[PDB]
Design a protein around this ligand. Structure first.
Ligand SMILES: Nc1nc2c(ncn2[C@@H]2O[C@H](COP(=O)(O)OP(=O)(O)OP(=O)(O)O)[C@@H](O)[C@H]2O)c(=O)[nH]1
Ligand SMILES: Nc1nc2c(ncn2[C@@H]2O[C@H](COP(=O)(O)OP(=O)(O)OP(=O)(O)O)[C@@H](O)[C@H]2O)c(=O)[nH]1
Ligand SMILES: Nc1nc2c(ncn2[C@@H]2O[C@H](COP(=O)(O)OP(=O)(O)O)[C@@H](O)[C@H]2O)c(=O)[nH]1
Ligand SMILES: Nc1nc2c(ncn2[C@@H]2O[C@H](COP(=O)(O)OP(=O)(O)O)[C@@H](O)[C@H]2O)c(=O)[nH]1
Ligand SMILES: [Mg+2]
Ligand SMILES: [Mg+2]
Lengths: 22, 426, 68, 50, 427, 426, 436
């Protein structure tokens, strides 16, 4: 669950960066 | 002393104008080094109409090359007789327009025109008396049609009392090269109707047909086509550079060939175009030249002259001829084909005479007709425009740069009103 | 989550300042462009009036000659 | 870093804005002066014409 | 007028090896790189007698870059350009896009910016990958997104290799290709198309190669690439750069998946007797049995063709060949497109290589086609994706690496929207 | 009969003066050996302006050289045209001012000008009848502004009669070679506004612009910027050194160019300037020279003259010349640029002619304008001074040699009221 | 234009050995202290007079003194490659050594050899004529380098005073360190280093190991490599006193351009373009990118991120065929760059300088031979981070009064432990207020 939390945070942060880019 | 400055736009205009200079420099007798090596003094009186005197006898043509890519400029400089221009006049960008009329007229045109107008102004007020500009530009492209068109508009709003010839090829089903041919052509002619004083329409389709039949050529590269175009253009303006029995200049032809302001497109041809194996047989006389001139195919357009009416016609004869022998041939043509010529204008044809033939030949003739049959040529573009525009194909690569959806409807409406105006007199 | 809270408030303040500077950017660029083209038009009008007054004063000398 | 750099660019652009406004103000002053002188010399021409 | 080349994955960095083998001889550059300004658009001269390519090879595993590092062109590239990782994405879009990708993409982008700053007249980027793999699909998406967010207004040319209907070497490659297309639809600018099976068939028939390996495939893809890029290098009659391509061929921002063809490819034993004039090479370029994508374009309607002729070719004979093509009855363009050809002519005939297979032909033709028939590959891929995905097969790898059901569903529905748009534009 | 006692200080002054002596020796036909091997003989008549006879033909140039390290007396003595400068005209310390003003104006220059004045007075007493002094140097440097400016003060004290040409290269905003420019620049402009009878101001951000645009060079090293400055400084005295149709000496220029006593900050040009690759494409003529002079990028003073309004201007021509056309052009420019001229003077421009064009060229000119656009070229230094002095940066290097902050404040006051004075009389 | 150098401590002497093996390379001096007679390279009899004064037939005695207490490295030089070169007396070697003790180096055993050092420095001063200044090289985290180095700096400032003092010192790295009492021995010597060195130019063992690892790809570098590539920087910045140039910048220009305040002189360094012998000829080493490589954060000799503050001033010495145009056209790009931030003080905070001698290279070295190079010394504000680190990791030991007997029972007391830290607090205050 800890590694899943890490991956989810990374993915959502990159998603937010992408949304700001678009 | 009635100067003309030559502006070569796009790759097409660049190559055609380069051949034009390689022809006129030959006719006036100057080597690629700019040193005179002619034959008669009559070549030299009016060099200043197209050339400037550089130090030590060097002559430099009054030309401005202009485009958005350096390839055409480097090629034309490496070409023969391209060593005589001025590097100040040589101006180019770095991007390229990509047939995007919006790009040519708006994006990089706006950044290269601040310089093209400076060089044009320098070369134009370096001469005492302006007769008009001579712009060679394609129509189916973006870099030479849209940007050249905006250059024409700027020139029209700067010098509003001087003549303006443009030489423009057009799209056709048999010479279609870019996929946005109607989009470029209709948009360009929207402004060419508004600004250019006279726009000689040429076309690769009729040039090809001429080359294959009346020249019996094996394989013509663009060299021969631009050669024929340069021959026609050099024949257009010879009453300036040489004396004549009955001379005429650009404004003379304009007033005698454009009855109504929105009717300044032409169909032009030049004689004698002679196949080289069969020009040892024929005899060159005035009636022979007139028959070959009014040959329904020898016109450098695909708009059939016999599918329409001649509003006005004008033949520039060159050589030592008989003025009665010219006028009687023209009257014979009118009397024979009385149906075609516009009925409510008597003596629809004007014939000018210059006293010096082009190099080699003994006689020459240049036909310019303000036929109403060019409605066929314009519909051949308007139909493709409406077909491609109904589905909005390729549209967004013009709307991206700053165009709208209003401009295309405006352009189509203007094209249709021009077509209707040509039809109304037929 | 004090770290998360402070970072979130940082981001909110940042977007506020960014909206301010974006409005400033829009106003600045548009006003610049319009005033520059207007400057060129004013230069054109100055040329117009200068040539007009030159012609007018030449005509002034003309009526001086006529009265002579 | 984006904020500070964009602020610097905006400030310099506004400085150019102020400079060009001053220059256009001078140009308008010249235009008004020439217009006034033109009208005065115009009435002078009219009276000497009479 | 420079264009830079980026190669990702096994297929990309082998096609690049073929391309550089081609270009070195095409410009006269020796292996290490010397001469005993046409090169300026691919190499950048540095120092006395030394030209380095404007490329970057990269991959998540080093066993495929090591032979490039120590091979016959070990003296060619900059030793810092042959990027390599330590563990490959292992046929996993998720692995190559989420946990191995985020290590090497930053270095790749830094070197890309270095090359862009070394450039002076940037025309565009051209990338190579096969979307059926993991380090191709995921890393290509992760790198294209950053390239677009950096440059944005400059052209990108993805020369992608989709899987084939029956000649396939993977089981997760439908998932890979579906998850890659959802981003290659929006981030690249022109997607040149290749398939392994169609090139196998053309090797079997035209070159009579009974058993063709990857060497011949790359050796005849590099020729198409050189043919469509030779306009920049060699000054010809009609000049077309990258800008006119995607202005003459792309009608809508979502239709840029264009087929590629080339003619002729005739062995040296038949080239002596063959008749390869312009009319017949065009008629053999437009035949379905010579297009490098496993599709039957006669099922669909063309929208835009781009014909790059090379060699002793004049303009009116290509005009006549175009006339014959548009008069033919079996192939038809959409109603709204009266003119649908973009013809360019170049004066440099194609280059052959010692140890090669093709012949020293006088003239040749490359072709890029945008037609409605290309949706059949997408429909097939959708079908053979959903066939696996109806049982959640192989999803545990992607989920454990960090994907989720939502991304799969959204990619599938985006492919569905693409298919419906193709059906609409085929009307 | 009239002599120009040239003075060189700094590294600028040394190298530029070496270039100027190079060009002068080239014109007068003195080879670098020291003797004379000229072909024409109208050149001997005015050798005494820049040269002394020694014995049997060992000519020597009269000019002073001063610097605070031998690293320049070696690099000047080593270069071409170096074996003619008198060895005794080498007064150099071995300390180096070090970009500072106090150390070069109050300690080291203070102890060295006592001996520099010795040689300059010896040359003054060796020349029969003076014509003026001509110093050439920099302002943003250690021993270019400090010791040279102290020498200017001393000369203005001892010889009130004679004029002072001051060819001064100032710092630039973009091309900033050293850190404390706007201290050493202000603390010398303040001292030059009191004494310099006329100072011609220069820079490098315009020399590189010229070498890019007009001369079409690619790697403009210092040896060509200094060459342009050499050519101008040589041409500034053509009407004194050679016959003509309307001669113009230094006092004539000053009286024609200085309406108020605090308006002696010129801006300078030179024509023509074209590349070796396009020399032949253009024919030199009075119009081309004139509308090259009256441009916006052909001024070495990188302050946009289009913003300012020319108080007074001077045009010095050289070559066989149609004086009617010269003053017709000098009036045509004045009439067509009325709004860019200050309108409480009639005939804002003064045109003079000499009849010996330089070697190589056939017709040359030189432009000297005392325009009001020179307010910005002091605004830059003033604003830098405010921004840096506000926090007293670098100030300890200044106050460590007896300096006081009140001096900086007075310099600020002088610069501000002078720029307000230009703006007022604009 | 003469300059002399003193080398103190293990690090100082190990730097100087490479430094003076490189100078003989530049000036073509044989490794036995003379100039070849059969051939020659370059020219200019006044080139070597800044470094190698002549007294004899052809033998050149250098202008450096190598002084140390432990007789282990000085005699290593005495038996190494350079025996005839050095003067047999410029090599000072005591009997015992300071042994990581500032009090030992400055109060008990360094005080009986400093007079012997000064009475040879005076002889060298009488020998030379145009003495530009002193260039000292020492490690502040050791023994003699900190203790008697500080002693000799103070004594030199008392004796000569007027002449320039360029220090090239070595603080410890933030994490890499080869001593236990380094914070003490550094925050002690900072008191003398603050108000006696005219300009301090800083090094970092770790920040140069990282450079070696990433640029030259020497995975496991060492002191020899580090000190070679610092000899490079020293020679690069000491070329304007030796060779010609379109724009010269000597010691006076350094001090007038990069020292905006008497107590603010602490310099980041850089030397571009560093490259190996394999990735050199594949690259386009243009000025427009070697300047960017000099100004990039990951290529500075001092371990400190330059983004944390604002540059105050910069000085860029150049070697090779660098024209005076591209330097300006690229300094414009630097001043408009999107990542650095200057301070509103100086709109003009650059001082270029150009030589005509291309950079040298030690045979058997890992650095390539290239036409042009740049060495940049920058006065910035982020260097206060280093002193913050040192104070924070000094207070940890001072709280427990650890290691303090090794000083108080030997030569010194606690008042200076307090004062040498309050001085660093004041320095941090100064940098913080400059950052405004
Ligand atoms: N033209 C060409 N295609 C190749 C070659 N090698 C492999 N391919 C294609 O590449 C596909 C394999 O997917 P890739 O993404 O390239 O495999 P990869 O690069 O090792 O990446 P992974 O998924 O991590 O294994 C196959 O379907 C082939 O069609 C080659 O040498 N030449
Ligand atoms: N940068 C650099 N540092 C060195 C070199 N040699 C030794 N050092 C440094 O020296 C530090 C330890 O102090 P030392 O130099 O050995 O001692 P010292 O200054 O010579 O004085 P002593 O204590 O008497 O030996 C270490 O942190 C090293 O980084 C070198 O060649 N280059
Ligand atoms: N007469 C002539 N026509 C040419 C030549 N070169 C190209 N063309 C014609 O120009 C058309 C293409 O114009 P285009 O390239 O789109 O215009 P551009 O973008 O402004 O250069 C083609 O249909 C050719 O027929 C030439 O050398 N001579
Ligand atoms: N235009 C020009 N500037 C030069 C030349 N040589 C040096 N400079 C400039 O001189 C300035 C510094 O001069 P300075 O150091 O005071 O000269 P010094 O006092 O003689 O040592 C720098 O900004 C250089 O750009 C030259 O030949 N031409
Ligand atoms: Mg892989
Ligand atoms: Mg020791």
């Amino acid at each position: 669950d800890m590694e899943k939390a890490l991956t989810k945070r990374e993915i959502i942060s990159v998603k937010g960066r992408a949304t700001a880019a678009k | 002393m009635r100067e003309i400055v030559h502006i070569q736009g796009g790759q097409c205009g660049n190559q055609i104008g380069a051949k034009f200079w390689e022809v006129v420099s030959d006719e006036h007798g100057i080597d690629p080094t700019g040193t005179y090596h002619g034959d008669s003094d009559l070549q030299l009186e009016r060099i200043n109409v197209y050339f400037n005197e550089a130090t030590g006898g060097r002559y430099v043509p009054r030309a401005i090359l202009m485009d958005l890519e350096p390839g055409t400029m480097d090629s034309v400089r490496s070409g023969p007789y391209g060593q005589i221009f001025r590097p100040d006049n040589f101006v180019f960008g770095q991007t390229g327009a990509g047939n995007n009329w919006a790009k040519g007229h708006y994006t990089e045109g706006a950044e290269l025109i601040d310089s093209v107008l400076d060089v044009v102004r320098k070369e134009a007020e370096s001469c005492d008396c302006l007769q008009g500009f001579q712009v060679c530009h394609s129509l189916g492209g973006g870099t030479g049609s849209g940007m050249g068109t905006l250059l024409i508009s700027k020139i029209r709003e700067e010098y509003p009392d001087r003549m303006m010839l443009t030489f423009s090829v057009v799209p056709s089903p048999k010479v279609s090269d870019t996929v946005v041919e109607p989009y470029n052509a209709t948009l360009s002619v929207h402004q060419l109707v508004e600004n250019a004083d006279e726009c000689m329409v040429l076309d690769n389709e009729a040039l090809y047909d001429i080359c294959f039949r009346t020249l019996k050529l094996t394989t013509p590269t663009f060299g021969d086509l631009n050669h024929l175009i340069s021959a026609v253009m050099s024949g257009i303006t010879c009453c300036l550079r040489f004396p004549g029995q009955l001379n005429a200049d650009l404004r003379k032809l304009a007033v005698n060939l454009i009855p109504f302001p929105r009717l300044h497109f032409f169909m032009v041809g030049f004689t004698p175009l002679t196949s080289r194996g069969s020009q040892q047989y024929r005899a060159l006389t005035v009636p022979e030249l007139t028959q070959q001139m009014w040959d329904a195919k020898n016109m450098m357009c695909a708009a059939d002259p016999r599918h329409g009416r001649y509003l006005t016609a004008s033949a520039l004869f060159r050589g030592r001829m008989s003025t009665k022998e010219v006028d009687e041939q023209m009257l014979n043509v009118q009397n024979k084909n009385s149906s075609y010529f516009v009925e409510w204008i008597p003596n629809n044809v004007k014939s000018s005479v210059c006293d010096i033939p082009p190099k080699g030949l003994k006689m020459s003739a240049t036909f310019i007709g303000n036929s109403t049959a060019i409605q066929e040529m314009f519909k051949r573009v308007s139909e493709q425009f409406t077909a491609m525009f109904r589905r909005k194909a390729f549209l967004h690569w013009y709307t991206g740069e700053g165009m709208d959806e209003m401009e295309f409807t405006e352009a189509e409406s203007n094209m249709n009103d021009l077509v209707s105006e040509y039809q109304q007199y037929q | 989550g004090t770290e998360n809270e402070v970072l979130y408030v940082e981001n909110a303040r940042m977007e506020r300042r960014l909206e301010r500077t974006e409005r400033a950017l829009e106003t600045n660029m548009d006003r610049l462009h319009i005033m520059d083209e207007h400057l060129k038009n004013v230069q054109q009008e100055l040329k117009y009036t200068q040539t007009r007054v030159e012609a007018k004063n030449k005509e002034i000398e003309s009526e001086k000659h006529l009265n002579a | 870093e984006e904020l500070r750099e964009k602020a610097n660019a905006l400030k310099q652009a506004k400085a150019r804005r102020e400079a060009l406004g001053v220059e256009l103000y001078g140009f308008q002053q010249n235009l008004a002066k020439l217009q006034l002188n033109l009208e005065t010399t115009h009435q002078n021409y009219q009276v000497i014409n009479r | 007028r420079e264009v830079i080349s980026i190669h990702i994955g096994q297929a990309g960095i082998q096609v690049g090896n073929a391309c550089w083998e081609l270009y070195c001889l095409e410009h006269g550059i020796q292996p290490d790189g010397q001469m005993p300004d046409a090169f300026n658009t691919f190499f950048s001269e540095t120092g006395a007698g030394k030209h380095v390519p404007r490329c970057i090879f990269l991959d998540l595993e080093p066993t495929v870059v090591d032979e490039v590092r120590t091979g016959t062109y070990r003296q060619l590239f900059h030793p810092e350009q042959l990027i390599s990782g330590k563990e490959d994405a292992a046929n996993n879009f998720a692995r190559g896009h989420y946990t191995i990708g985020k290590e090497i993409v930053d270095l790749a982008l830094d070197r890309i910016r270095k090359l862009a700053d070394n450039c002076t007249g940037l025309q565009g980027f051209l990338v190579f990958n096969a979307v059926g793999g993991g380090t191709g699909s995921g890393l290509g998406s992760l790198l294209l997104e950053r390239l677009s967010v950096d440059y944005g207004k400059k052209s990108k040319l993805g020369f992608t290799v989709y899987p084939s209907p029956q000649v396939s070497t993977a089981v997760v490659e439908p998932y890979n290709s579906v998850l890659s297309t959802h981003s290659l639809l929006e981030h690249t600018d022109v997607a040149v198309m290749l398939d392994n099976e169609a090139i196998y068939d053309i090797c079997r028939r035209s070159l009579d190669i009974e058993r063709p390996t990857y060497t011949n495939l790359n050796r005849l893809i590099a020729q198409v690439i050189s043919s469509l890029t030779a306009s920049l290098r060699f000054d010809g009659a009609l000049n077309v750069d990258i800008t006119e391509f995607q202005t003459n061929l792309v009608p809508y921002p979502r239709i840029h998946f264009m087929l590629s063809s080339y003619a002729p490819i005739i062995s040296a034993e038949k080239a002596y007797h063959e008749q390869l004039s312009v009319a017949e090479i065009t008629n053999a370029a437009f035949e379905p049995a010579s297009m490098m994508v496993k599709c039957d374009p006669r099922h669909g309607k063309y929208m835009a063709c781009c014909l790059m002729y090379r060699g002793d070719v004049v303009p009116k004979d290509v005009n006549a060949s175009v006339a014959t093509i548009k008069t033919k009855r079996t192939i038809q363009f959409v109603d709204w497109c009266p003119t649908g050809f973009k013809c360019g002519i170049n004066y440099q005939p194609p280059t052959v290589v010692p140890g090669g297979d093709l012949a020293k032909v006088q003239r040749a033709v490359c072709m890029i086609s945008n037609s409605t028939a290309i949706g059949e590959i997408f429909s097939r891929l959708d079908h053979k994706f959903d066939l696996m995905y109806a049982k959640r097969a192989f999803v545990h790898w992607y989920v454990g690496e960090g994907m989720e059901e939502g991304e799969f569903s959204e990619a599938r529905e985006d492919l569905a929207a693409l298919e419906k748009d193709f059906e609409e534009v085929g009307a």
